[PDB]
Amino acid sequence: SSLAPISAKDMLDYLACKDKKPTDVVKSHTEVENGKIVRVKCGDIVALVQKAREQSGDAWQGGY
Amino acid sequence: SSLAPISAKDMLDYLACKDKKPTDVVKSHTEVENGKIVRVKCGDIVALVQKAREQSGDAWQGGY
Amino acid sequence: SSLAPISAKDMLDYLACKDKKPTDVVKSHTEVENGKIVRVKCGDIVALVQKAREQSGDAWQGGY
Amino acid sequence: DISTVPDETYDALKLDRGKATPKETYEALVKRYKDPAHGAGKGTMGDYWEPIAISIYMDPNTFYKPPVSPKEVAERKDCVECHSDETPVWVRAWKRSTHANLDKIRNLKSDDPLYYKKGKLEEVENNLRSMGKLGEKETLKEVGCIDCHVDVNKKDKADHTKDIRMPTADTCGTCHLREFAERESERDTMVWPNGQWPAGRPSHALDYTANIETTVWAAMPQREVAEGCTMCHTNQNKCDNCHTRHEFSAAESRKPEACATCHSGVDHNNWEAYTMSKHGKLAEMNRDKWNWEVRLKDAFSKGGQNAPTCAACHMEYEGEYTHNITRKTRWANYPFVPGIAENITSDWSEARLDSWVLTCTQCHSERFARSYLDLMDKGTLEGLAKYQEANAIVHKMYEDGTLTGQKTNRPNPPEPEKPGFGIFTQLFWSKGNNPASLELKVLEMAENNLAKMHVGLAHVNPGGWTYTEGWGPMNRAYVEIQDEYTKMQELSALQARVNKLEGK
Amino acid sequence: DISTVPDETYDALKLDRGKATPKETYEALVKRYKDPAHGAGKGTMGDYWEPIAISIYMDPNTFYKPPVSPKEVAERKDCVECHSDETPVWVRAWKRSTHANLDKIRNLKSDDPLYYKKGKLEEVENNLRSMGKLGEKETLKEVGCIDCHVDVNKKDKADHTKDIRMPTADTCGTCHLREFAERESERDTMVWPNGQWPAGRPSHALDYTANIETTVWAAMPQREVAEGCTMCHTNQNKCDNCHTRHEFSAAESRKPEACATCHSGVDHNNWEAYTMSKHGKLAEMNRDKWNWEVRLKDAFSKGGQNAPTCAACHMEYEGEYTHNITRKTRWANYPFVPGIAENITSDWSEARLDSWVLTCTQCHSERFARSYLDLMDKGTLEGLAKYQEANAIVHKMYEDGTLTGQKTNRPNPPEPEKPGFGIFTQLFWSKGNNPASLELKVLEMAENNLAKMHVGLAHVNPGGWTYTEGWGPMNRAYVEIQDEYTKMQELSALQARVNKLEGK
Amino acid sequence: DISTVPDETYDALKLDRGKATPKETYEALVKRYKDPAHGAGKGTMGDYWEPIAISIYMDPNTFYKPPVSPKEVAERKDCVECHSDETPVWVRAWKRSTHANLDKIRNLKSDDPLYYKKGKLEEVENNLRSMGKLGEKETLKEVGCIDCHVDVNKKDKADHTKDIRMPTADTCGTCHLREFAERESERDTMVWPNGQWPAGRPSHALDYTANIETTVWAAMPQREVAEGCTMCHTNQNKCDNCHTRHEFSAAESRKPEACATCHSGVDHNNWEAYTMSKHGKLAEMNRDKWNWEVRLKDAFSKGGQNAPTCAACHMEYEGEYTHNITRKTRWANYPFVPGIAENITSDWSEARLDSWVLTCTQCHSERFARSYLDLMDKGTLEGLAKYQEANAIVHKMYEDGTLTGQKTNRPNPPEPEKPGFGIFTQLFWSKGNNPASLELKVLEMAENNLAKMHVGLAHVNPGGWTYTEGWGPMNRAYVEIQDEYTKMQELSALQARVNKLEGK
Numbered sequence A, B, C: 001s002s003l004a005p006i007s008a009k010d011m012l013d014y015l016a017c018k019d020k021k022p023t024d025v026v027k028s029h030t031e032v033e034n035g036k037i038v039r040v041k042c043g044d045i046v047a048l049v050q051k052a053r054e055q056s057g058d059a060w061q062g063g064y
Numbered sequence D, E, F: 001d002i003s004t005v006p007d008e009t010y011d012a013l014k015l016d017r018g019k020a021t022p023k024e025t026y027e028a029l030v031k032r033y034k035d036p037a038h039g040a041g042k043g044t045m046g047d048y049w050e051p052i053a054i055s056i057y058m059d060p061n062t063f064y065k066p067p068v069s070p071k072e073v074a075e076r077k078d079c080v081e082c083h084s085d086e087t088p089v090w091v092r093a094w095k096r097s098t099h100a101n102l103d104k105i106r107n108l109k110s111d112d113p114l115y116y117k118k119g120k121l122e123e124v125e126n127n128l129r130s131m132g133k134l135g136e137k138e139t140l141k142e143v144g145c146i147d148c149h150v151d152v153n154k155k156d157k158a159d160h161t162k163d164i165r166m167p168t169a170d171t172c173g174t175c176h177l178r179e180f181a182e183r184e185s186e187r188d189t190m191v192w193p194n195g196q197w198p199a200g201r202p203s204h205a206l207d208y209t210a211n212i213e214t215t216v217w218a219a220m221p222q223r224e225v226a227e228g229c230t231m232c233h234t235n236q237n238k239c240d241n242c243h244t245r246h247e248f249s250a251a252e253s254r255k256p257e258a259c260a261t262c263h264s265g266v267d268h269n270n271w272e273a274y275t276m277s278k279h280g281k282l283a284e285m286n287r288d289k290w291n292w293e294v295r296l297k298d299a300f301s302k303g304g305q306n307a308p309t310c311a312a313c314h315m316e317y318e319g320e321y322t323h324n325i326t327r328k329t330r331w332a333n334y335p336f337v338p339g340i341a342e343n344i345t346s347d348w349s350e351a352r353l354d355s356w357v358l359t360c361t362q363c364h365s366e367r368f369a370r371s372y373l374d375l376m377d378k379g380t381l382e383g384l385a386k387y388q389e390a391n392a393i394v395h396k397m398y399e400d401g402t403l404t405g406q407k408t409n410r411p412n413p414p415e416p417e418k419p420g421f422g423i424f425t426q427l428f429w430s431k432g433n434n435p436a437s438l439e440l441k442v443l444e445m446a447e448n449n450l451a452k453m454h455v456g457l458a459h460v461n462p463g464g465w466t467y468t469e470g471w472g473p474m475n476r477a478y479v480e481i482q483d484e485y486t487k488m489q490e491l492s493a494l495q496a497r498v499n500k501l502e503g504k
Ligand code: HEC
Pocket: D065, D066, D067, D069, D070, D072, D074, D075, D076, D078, D079, D080, D082, D083, D086, D145, D146, D147, D149, D150, D158, D160, D164, D165, E365, E366, E367, E368
């Protein structure tokens, strides 16, 4: 079945948070707000992706 | 001298009607109306083209 | 230091007026007005460029 | 057994690879190959379109009939003699091809780099014997006009008006069962984890199916335009698009140029990106130093090849080469296809990334290759993010009904297409304000510029994802989308002010 | 008599083909060639433009004077000796050219594939003797600097400041009367049944005339831009654009690359379409296997050539090859030219189609070639139909006066151009809102995208009439035209509402 | 002394040409090369960006650390043994490279066109002896993996996890002092009269510095997009972008294709313009007649080369060929850069024009070469004038605050970029209406179309400054700018009337 959609910016942030602590902060790869690259907390993006993976169910057969 | 103008869509329907009967109906190569390709009755387009060729006179020296 | 700017159309008119008398009239390379290529009096463009070269001062180390 | 054919194919054909004969394998392959349920014939929209004259060469199994003239009954050498006048270059090219020089192949010595061809000839003969087209002690004398165009190893006369055929993939596969089965195996090895693309796609095995199952292709009245599409989509039907008739030179098919007529253009500029990359520029500079006649397996050793080429990268899989080009596919050209980006981190994609790392490390260190492929993946997502932001704006206009002409001049596309927003049909058919400009612009941002951005990244052409293709053009589309969006908001604010004034 | 020169040329020159000598034929050809009534000189707009420095090389007969410096009186050997230092690569190229090695041509043996050049040298000598430039038993010793740049077979001193010339087509035609006459015969064979183009055009014989008779070329002030046009239009004046100075290699001029500098780009992308087709990719892949030195007559046999090239297709006519490239022309690149599309079913066009079929059927079957040429014609008309619909919208806006700035900021083009809708001048000159964006877009839709669509069809590059050139870009133009048309109607509606409110 | 290194370089290094040993010249070059004040390291915006994985290969001196695995200690011979299947082609290409065959170089005879290489070998040996890397009686045995990747002439074991380096320009320069010094001399020979570009730029010596000193490159979040820029800008750091690893073939770097991956695309289409020019089409047609192995000095004589190439034109200066490519630069690609057009008539530009004339007149007469270079200069200005007119329109709207979204939706670019009108940042970053569409259009009009116009003029591709690139696209930009300007005026007028009605 289909994968629950995940935006490209969230995929990017998720990859950037690979092997990071949930408290670590990384730069966005795509978002600029108020003249600064947005900073993303790895805990938030990981939660966001995991909840898409939960919604995917058996569609996600494994991987990062 | 100058050829009486015939639109491309008419040339196409004319060519679609090569070796068809006047009562044969062919699909337009160009026109879609109300979600369907327009159908063209061959006798009609032949009449359209022949009346242009009549206006061309001796400018049209033969051909399909 | 920096050169006083000279628009491209003036550079072109200047080049067109090389080895021309100030009273000579050449065609613009760039300007059309009222259906005709603008004509340029060589003494006007020579004056225009020379005053730019004066504002450039020592920035202009020589040349045409 | 054909060791290079995946197990998935013997499973799908309900064959035991340990026991199936060549004839059984061929017959099972061809039954599927010719089954309308598996993509043969005119497809699900055959009622909406009819062949044009050239279609008899594009899909001969459905459409080819021999010519009504000449009325000739010809033997094998009659073909050659008459066509020495009617199609003289075909005869010249055929005469100097391997097909017409099989005794040369038989007499190759084990120290010749082309010696593998003798084994292939002997496998062909074994195939034909299993099929009963060739005696157990009979050598294949040649592959001549009558063989491909009438019947393999035909000994008697052919009726030109009844018996001529255009050779399709199953014709070649009568002899070249291995390559045909490797090709057909793409049906079975290209299964997306989440059905991102239909099973066996994208692939050469199903390129024609993919073509005729495209709604606007079936639906548009401009048949000669649509057949342009078909000319890029005939690998399924005929085997002569990389190694062309009538020379059928494997050396030709190994050259990047063989892929370029199809794998080029505004929505997949592989040729342009590849040839501008250092890889492709080296291939251009070094082409006359390489022996293109050695098989891909020997290209980098015996062949002297020191830069990668389309065929070497894409037919390589786990250190071997087969005609199946699907097994390392991860992005499949269009990054925005639902599920493709999300699947890029899966175990399935990582394992194909591992296979790609094996390809690149014929030359580069793994560290180098992996660092670039990481750039490819993330660069593609960066492009996709830019598109997704622009699409959200225009799609919202669609849902709000504020696209130009959306409610006044948006005629429906031709049957059997269904109306919608930013659909592929709008690239090949337009009427009134279907599509709107902003809609076409954001669709082309994905279909053209994001796709070409990804191709440039995959093929290491820096300009092809930054200044010249990809980022730059996507930047412009984004800018104009935002610009028109603001202008449309400003205009509707002005209209509202007028509407308020009309309320007195 | 020149077997390859058509009757129409002898009749046009008031010559009897059964009586005319090389001398009489040459003089009548050159008389017409240098006649300003037949296209020589500055043309009908010479009062509007002046040569620039390089114009002396582009139109030498009108503009060239020899340099004031150096002051040298020089004999034949002096040219070579001094230019060995002044222009060393010219001397090196000349020295290894056929022109400098006529004795090698004299000694060619009948089994040499280049043997025909011996016959050609004897025809040159026959030409020169007829002209009184060579003794009847005097061998032509060489074609050296002094021959081309001063006088053929000059025996004494030349004054560098008075006697140097740039060799124009009639200079070469002194010796190469056949090729010059064949080229000039384009004036007489390219007669359109209804004056769709001026007689003799399009052709290489009149390309420079066509250039200087283009209003915007004469009228625009950016002369260096305009001379870019001139550089593609000098075949009329000089014979070195396909086989270049100073090697003058016929093998070079047979290569497709020879045509590419001129036959490319946004309004006729023949180089790009051909090279992307299978034909052109095959030519790229096999160029090293072909003997480019054999004449086109021998290319497909002695040359090994197995894919078609520009010269082999376009110089072939009824089984012969000449420098006349006009006799199979039917569409002439621009499908929207009044009368062209209507003429495509005429007997005249059908006879040229039959001539094309003869060209394709050196290789393909006639049924195959005809099926494709049918697709070419119909696919061109489908593109034309799309343009015609879009043009009807914008042209009506022009007639309604409603193009942007049409009544407020549409200054007149430079003299002698006259104002009009969607005129060629608007591609190379613009000011204010002349043209309007919609006007330029619909003009470019015909001039660029429909032309390229046809070129892609004619040269069998499927992406070139579907996705990448032609249909896709024309689709976008139509969409944007329709979009702006609706926006402009909605703006007019809003202005009418505000005008009503001001009527209180 | 190094005859080809300019005095300005010895002066900048505080060295005496006569006395400075190879080792002292090298150390002085390397000290400047590695000095952050002179362009090394992360540059002034290092706080804003971090390397990505591939950056270790793009700027090794700043970012490279050897792999943590494999844990191996290796002698010279062990590199080849393990890498023969770890990185097979690197070994195969290295093995047939000149670096692996120095004995063939020693045995070259003085009549061999490649003999110069024996002298280059002995000069390398003399350099290494001065640096203490080679005994005075010790011949350089080879240049193997361990020499470039660990230490020159290394005699003992290397720790794969600690001692592996990526060879940078200073690594090659250890042996190839002349070529490295010539390259570095670009820092000293490229002083603009009025600082039109920074001293030493544009150049290969400072290309990476120029990249990392570009604000949007440091500022933009899409690092994989930004690293595409870096890949065209690594000559400063590593010497293998023209003669690539691991063949390191000087013959390869002399081919135009070597330059094409970087010198191509929408803002400098040198590859495209040159290859379409007659020069480039001749180079394509004649590439297999030329001996690319002779040095550029001998190309036109011993190499049989008869058409110019990128290297032959741009590495030539006053009759010598060196790695310094800056000394005839006048326009530097972007004609709109302040002070560049005004400087084109200076004595400084005229002397570089004289140098260009000396290049062209190896073939053309001076009169011809000057007449074309005059066309190039005036044509470029004609393009600049068209852009200046369009820019004045859009710039005035920016200054007046009337660009679309300018005061309502124009967010600031990422730090440390400062907001502005038509800035380079707006080609690689956009958000909301920053930039506005008109603003991007007029920025691209200069950055892409005016640039390509000049590249087309400079490289003699007539379509490349008229119809296809340059004038045509600039014409459309002008037309669309003027069109939107008029629409925006008319809209403002309508809004002003609705404002009047809301005042009553
Ligand atoms: C003349 C005496 C012929 C002999 C003997 C054979 N062929 Fe033929 N062939 C001939 C002609 C004049 C044509 C052109 C028909 C047309 O209208 O194009 C052909 C064509 C073919 C083709 C192409 C068929 C198509 O649909 O395009 C093929 C594949 C072909 N011929 C094959 C062929 C074979 C296999 C023959 C020996 C059994 C043979 N031809 C004999 C003339 C003659």
